[PDB]
């Protein structure tokens, strides 16, 4: 497979790759370009739909422009965009396999004109000349007369009707509606009989919309269209009447169900297809059986008549061989969820086929040379910088309902509600569906495996095509008219509340009285539920005007703090399904349970079912429990029969459970998802209101006597605060999502499962009675045998209880959710250092791709738990670049790293991000560090952190939380400072932070920058988990190693070094007395069985060597003290370990007994093998200091 | 993993599945492939 990327609209008509063909049998012709075998691209708009559509027939959400794709430049841009999308798809294995399958999956060819697919007739040609003796009449060549006689139905005809070109797919531009991707067939009859037919695709790659917080990649839409076309190619299109319920139209005051075709659900992916397509299958139709039977028939025909024939080209034969290599189940199991995981593309996953009703789309223009590459969106799917399209003003809006809120009878407000646009059905579908018993009574990322790309690439192209005379029937445009109702009411609907939060005036004002807002003639009020923000605004009202940048900074900080506190407010309550984090403000917005008192109070004294306005929508499905048929048999054989019946009944009881689950999803979860969509629309409205307020205030300030530099700084601070507010709003959205999803699940648990249990409880009796009757009707069995069998083949309640709360949670989780979880990070910089093989790599792995510039002079050593930057040479610098490092006014962050200073203690800078005065700094000063933070208004805050003496490992963790105006600084695992930074304004400094040595060699390890404040528990956990690495360390913190000279200290006495003392012609280790505290301490050495080993590990067994005669440690058997013997043979084998919470101190063990000190004995404290419990447990912890 | 017939490398094969009698049970064999073993490198710590 190779996509031809060397074509342009100006390419000559060569009749081989660029052609001018006819549109079906009409009088129009169009130009087509072949970018791959049997795949063509036609940039011009689709010929079928008429460009001029009467306003009555225009559909909701559509964009109509008859001048689009009329000029050649637009056509060339469209063609290049299609080629780029195809290249992006083919860049991945899944896309290559899909495209190869599309190319090879030609429609089945019709038989010879006479009929059959077996063999052609024969002919003879070339009679030899009359020889001297023999006439030689019969000496001639033999030919298959109708070679390649197979009639084909996939061909485009030239304008002259004298040439035909093979084609399976033809990608056109959009039809009458600019934004409507569609896939249509060539012949309806051939798309359902299993023969197949060519497909035509309408695609619009220049427009996309934003869902949630990401943009939609058109490649996914193209893949969806291609998958839908695959059905047409294989001729397995189901009847248009095979629809299924998709969503309950809650907004209507009637029982109406929206319906979706099976193909659309199976192809579109998402979470909807997961409730259908279960094991066992609860939904079934004759379509699947007919398709499988026809596919098997065609495969048999190919295998018994096509392969043997030697009078037909391989262009068709080899393609058909690969076409039937795959199975129909593979196609049915192929959906967008697989490509989303393969391509790591986010897409809508809930009711993605009915998004028109949930929220209105805003379209953005895509420049393909620039915004989209073979690797997807430039700068990612989230950070791509696109521009809102100018066609958004031409979007058609035909509401399905027009709510006219009144009051006595004066219309205060008028809101519009839009439909899904899918086919509807008033008749109940669940109540009239029979879960079948004698069908699907078994079966209680591998779909495209059978495709072989290389073989497809080896296929010769089709040159000569024998055309089928009638392969095109006609095109039937679909005309639709959208209705519009008027539902008058006096109780405001949620949509009215949502619309009350939008405005056009730039000098509006927040208000909390909905009636006051709507009754406003001036239209100067906007409804908002932000209590704290409005209260603060009213507090400052009638105060001194804002003139100084200091006042503006304080005002903006307070506004941001109040907005975040209000939006993220939650209250935890105890529900049966654990604990739920309810949203306090969900009542004031959307006008739900807003009658009085706290919303949480009503939500607790009333089930979560109360949120939705349409309850009790269940319907009992039809049940067909066939009775056991009869001939006698022995207990040995009858037992297997009864066991099989038991299993079949269990499976049927699931088929029903699954049906009830699908009912819950379609009728109950739809309302909760609608509530989610309405709630996240309010958050964006409030964010827009706050941003407009801030912009208005900044504009007012700009008309003041202030320097340009300060104004630019204020503008940058506002820009950063906008990102901060966006982050807060996203947190609120996540909280809303989690809360409402949990509410829906617990609604299923507490409101539907009991009814399912009740219904089956009335059905298990029938099965039990039938089984008992059948058992009693059998003669060849003992009475005790019958009683035992009845006791075995009877169903209790617990026999049909399938509820699994975790399975439901994993059922409403889409690939998009997994991708978001994977892509969610709290680190703006997470250093990763590797030495490799003379190829040292230092880089950020948090995903923010910080530019790191380091000199080659740096080195890497194993500091604590990995490679650590080692700055030794003077004037060594390391710089990290990132926009987020600019900080600002309202943003909380934290630095965390491990430091070791090998120098002394003059002042010396270590890390800084200062720009003249603004920023933060760290530097050694005296025998400790100093942390300095300074704003652009002169306010400073310098803290001195003592006890940072050299030759020790320290764990620095600094946190700045601007929500509480709290500064936390930890060293090791202790809290040193808890100062307040309420007077610290904008610290906008720079995009790069420099790390320098300045004549002091240093190890720096595990540098990390977090975009949030940290807690003491987090610091303690990280500090103690980092050091849990199976290595024993000296008091300094460096790895303990064998053969190194050390000094031994006891944790209880951290200033006394043990020394040898001779007593009773024996040498024991004791502690220096208070008076004689000047004697030089004894020096030790650790030996090991494997002398090659250097670095000590936990549980290691070794021998302690003490230095003239090379003494060794032995344990006296008379007094239990530790003595010294001049022989390694008699020395004991000590085991080394350490405590997790005392990282730098180790423990000796022998025979599972810890060595420890002893109580005072006439100015001595011996080293002993203790067993008494009267010695404190801290006395058996030792420390080794480098000597 | 199965040791290669000729090359000194381990080829990767696909695990077997239960296909004996019942459609109600399905699992993949585990006691297949080369039998691996972990040997102490230095034998420094106690062998107990």
From Swiss-Prot, chain B:
<protein>
    <recommendedName>
        <fullName>Botulinum neurotoxin B heavy chain</fullName>
    </recommendedName>
</protein>
<comment type="function">
    <text>Responsible for host epithelial cell transcytosis, host nerve cell targeting and translocation of light chain (LC) into host cytosol. Composed of 3 subdomains; the translocation domain (TD), and N-terminus and C-terminus of the receptor-binding domain (RBD). The RBD is responsible for the adherence of the toxin to the cell surface. It simultaneously recognizes 2 coreceptors; polysialated gangliosides and host synaptotagmin-1 and -2 (SYT1 and SYT2) which bind simultaneously to adjacent but separate sites at the tip of the HC.</text>
</comment>
């Amino acid at each position: 497979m190779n996509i031809n990327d060397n074509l342009s609209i100006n390419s000559p008509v060569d009749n081989k790759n660029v052609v001018v063909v006819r549109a079906r049998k009409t009088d129009t012709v169009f130009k087509a370009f072949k970018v791959a075998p049997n795949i063509w691209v036609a940039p011009e708009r689709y010929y079928g739909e008429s460009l001029s559509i009467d306003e009555e027939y225009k559909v909701d959400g559509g964009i109509y422009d008859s001048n689009f794709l009329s000029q050649d430049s637009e056509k060339d841009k469209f063609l290049q965009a299609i080629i780029t999308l195809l290249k992006r798809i083919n860049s991945t294995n899944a896309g290559e396999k899909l495209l190869s399958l599309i190319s090879t999956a030609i429609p089945f060819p019709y038989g010879y004109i006479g009929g059959g697919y077996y063999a052609p007739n024969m002919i003879t040609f070339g009679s030899a000349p009359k020889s001297n003796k023999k006439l030689n009449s019969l000496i001639s060549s033999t030919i298959p007369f109708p070679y390649a006689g197979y009639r084909e139905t996939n061909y485009l005809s030239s304008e002259d009707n004298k040439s035909f070109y093979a084609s399976n797919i033809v990608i056109f531009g959009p039809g009458a509606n600019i934004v409507e991707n569609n896939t249509v067939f060539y012949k309806k009859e051939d798309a359902e009989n299993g023969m197949g037919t060519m497909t035509e695709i309408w695609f619009q790659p220049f427009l996309t919309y934003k869902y949630d917080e990401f943009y939609i990649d058109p490649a996914i839409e193209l893949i969806k269209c291609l998958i839908k076309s695959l059905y047409f190619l294989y001729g397995i299109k189901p009847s248009d009447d095979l629809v299924i319920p998709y969503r309950l139209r809650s907004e209507l005051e009637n029982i109406e169900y929206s319906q979706l075709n099976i193909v659309d659900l199976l192809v579109s992916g998402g979470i909807d297809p997961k409730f259908i397509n279960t094991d066992p299958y609860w939904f079934t139709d004759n379509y699947f059986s007919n398709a499988k039977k026809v596919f098997e028939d065609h495969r048999n025909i190919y295998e018994t008549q096509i392969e043997g024939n030697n009078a037909i080209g391989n262009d068709i034969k080899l393609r058909l061989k690969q076409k039937f290599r795959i199975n129909i189940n593979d196609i049915w199991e192929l959906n967008l969820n697989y490509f989303s995981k393969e391509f790591s593309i986010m897409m809508p996953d809930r009711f993605n086929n009915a998004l028109k009703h949930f929220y209105r789309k805003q379209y953005y223009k895509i420049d393909y040379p620039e915004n989209y590459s073979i690797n997807g969106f430039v700068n990612g799917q989230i950070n791509v910088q696109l521009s809102l399209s100018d066609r958004n003003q031409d979007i058609i809006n035909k509401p399905e309902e027009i709510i006219n809120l009144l009051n006595n009878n004066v219309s205060l407000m008028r809101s519009n509600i839009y439909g899904d646009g899918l086919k509807s059905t008033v008749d109940d579908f669940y109540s009239n569906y029979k879960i079948p018993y004698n069908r699907a009574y078994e079966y209680h990322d591998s779909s495209l495996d059978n495709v072989n790309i290389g073989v497809i690439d080896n296929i010769p192209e089709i040159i000569d095509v024998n055309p089928y005379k009638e392969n095109c029937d006609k095109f039937s445009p679909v005309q639709k008219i959208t209705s519009t109702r008027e539902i008058n009411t006096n109780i405001p609907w949620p949509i009215n509340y949502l619309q009350a939060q939008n405005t056009n005036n730039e000098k509006f004002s927040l208000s909390s009285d909905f009636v006051e807002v709507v009754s406003s003639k001036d239209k100067s009020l906007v409804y908002s539920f932000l209590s704290n923000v409005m209260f603060y605004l009213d507090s400052i009202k009638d105060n001194s005007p804002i003139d100084t940048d200091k006042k503006y900074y304080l005002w903006l900080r307070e506004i941001f703090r109040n907005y975040s506190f209000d939006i993220t407010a939650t209250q935890e309550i105890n529900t049966d399904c654990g604990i739920n984090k309810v949203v306090t403000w969900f009542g004031k917005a959307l006008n739900i349970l807003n009658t009085s008192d706290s919303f949480v109070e009503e939500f607790q004294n009333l089930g979560p079912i109360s949120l939705i306005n349409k309850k009790e929508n269940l319907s009992m499905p039809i049940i067909e429990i066939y009775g056991i048929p009869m001939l006698g048999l022995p207990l040995n054989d009858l037992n297997e029969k009864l066991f099989n019946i038991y299993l079949k009944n269990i499976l049927y009881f699931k088929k029903v459970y699954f049906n009830f689950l699908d009912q819950w999803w379609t009728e109950y979860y739809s309302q909760y998802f609608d509530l989610i969509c309405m709630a996240k629309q309010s958050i964006l409205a409030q964010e827009k209101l706050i941003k407009q307020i801030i912009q208005n205030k900044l504009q007012d300030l700009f008309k003041a006597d202030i320097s340009m530099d300060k104004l630019n700084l204020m503008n940058l601070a506002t820009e950063k605060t906008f990102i901060d507010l966006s982050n807060e709003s996203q947190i609120a959205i996540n909280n809303i999502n989690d809360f409402l999803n949990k509410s829906a699940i617990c609604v299923f648990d507490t409101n539907i499962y009991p009814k399912f249990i009740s219904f089956m409880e009335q059905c298990i009796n029938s099965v039990n009675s039938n089984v008992t009757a059948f058992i009693q009707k059998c003669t060849n069995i003992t009475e005790d045998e019958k009683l035992q069998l009845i006791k075995l083949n009877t169903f209790m309640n617990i026999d049909f209880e399938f509820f699994d709360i975790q399975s439901i949670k994993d059922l409403i989780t889409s690939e998009t959710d997994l991708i978001k979880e994977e892509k969610e990070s709290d680190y703006n910089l997470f250093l990763f250092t590797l030495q490799e093989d003379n190829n040292k790599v230092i880089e950020d792995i948090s995903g923010k791709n910080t530019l790191v510039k380091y000199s080659d002079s740096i080195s890497l050593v194993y500091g604590v738990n990995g490679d650590a930057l080692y700055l030794k040479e003077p004037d060594e610098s390391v710089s990290f670049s990132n926009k987020a490092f600019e900080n600002g006014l309202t943003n909380s962050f934290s630095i965390c790293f491990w430091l070791r200073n090998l120098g002394e203690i003059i002042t010396s800078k270590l890390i800084e991000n200062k720009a003249d005065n603004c920023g933060w700094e760290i530097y050694f000063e005296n025998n400790g560090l100093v942390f300095s933070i300074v704003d652009c208004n002169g306010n400073e805050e310098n803290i001195y952190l003592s006890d940072v003496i050299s030759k020790n490992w320290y764990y620095i963790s600094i946190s700045i939380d601007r929500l509480r105006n709290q500064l936390l600084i930890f060293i090791n695992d202790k809290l040193i400072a808890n100062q307040s930074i309420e007077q610290i304004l904008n610290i906008y400094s720079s995009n790069t932070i420099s790390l320098v040595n300045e004549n002091n060699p240093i190890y720096i390890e595990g540098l990390s920058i977090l975009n949030r404040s940290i807690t003491s528990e987090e610091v303690v956990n990280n500090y103690f988990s980092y050091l849990n690495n199976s290595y024993i360390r000296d008091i300094s913190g460096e790895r303990l190693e064998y053969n190194k000279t050390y000094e031994l200290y006891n944790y209880v006495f951290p200033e006394n070094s043990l020394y040898e003392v001779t007593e009773n012609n024996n040498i024991y280790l004791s502690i220096k007395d208070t008076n004689n505290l000047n004697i030089q301490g004894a020096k030790f050495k650790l030996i090991n069985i494997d002398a090659n080993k250097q670095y000590v590990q936990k549980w290691d067994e070794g021998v302690v060597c003490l230095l003239d005669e090379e003494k060794y440690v032995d344990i006296s058997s008379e007094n239990n003290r530790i003595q010294l013997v001049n022989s390694k043979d008699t020395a004991k084998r000590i085991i080394f370990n350490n405590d997790i919470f005392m990282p730098n101190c180790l423990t000796f063990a022998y025979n599972n007994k810890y060595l420890s000190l002893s109580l005072r004995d006439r100015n001595y404290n011996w080293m002993i093998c203790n067993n008494n419990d009267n010695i404190p447990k801290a006395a058996h912890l030792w420390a080794l200091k480098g000597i | 993993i199965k040791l290669k017939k000729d090359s000194p490398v381990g080829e990767i094969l696909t695990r077997s599945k239960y296909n004996q009698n019942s459609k109600y049970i399905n699992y993949r064999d585990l006691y297949i492939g080369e039998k691996f073993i972990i040997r102490r490198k230095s034998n420094s710590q106690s062998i107990n």
